Amino acid sequence: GSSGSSGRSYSCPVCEKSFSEDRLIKSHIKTNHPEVS
Ligand SMILES: [Zn+2]
């Protein structure tokens, strides 16, 4: 059968801060942790 509905939250790989969207954690990694991306 076909897949159901989905949605997820995220946590920083460097400082463990929570985020609600993939674009927001990527913006945080780019601004606060660029040498760790
Ligand atoms: Zn972080």
Swiss-Prot record:
The lineage of its organism: Eukaryota, Metazoa, Chordata, Craniata, Vertebrata. This is Zinc finger protein ZFAT. Zn(2+) 9 binds at residues 12, 15, 28, 33. It is found in: Nucleus; Cytoplasm, Cytosol. The chain holds residues 828 to 857 of 1243 of the full protein. The gene is ZFAT. May be involved in transcriptional regulation. Overexpression causes down-regulation of a number of genes involved in the immune response. Some genes are also up-regulated. A zinc finger (C2H2-type) spans 10-33. Isoform 1 is strongly expressed in placenta, spleen, kidney, testis and peripheral blood leukocytes. Expressed in CD4+ and CD8+ T-cells, CD19+ B-cells and CB14+ monocytes. Isoform 3 is strongly expressed in placenta, ovary, tonsil, CD19+ B-cells and CD14+ monocytes.
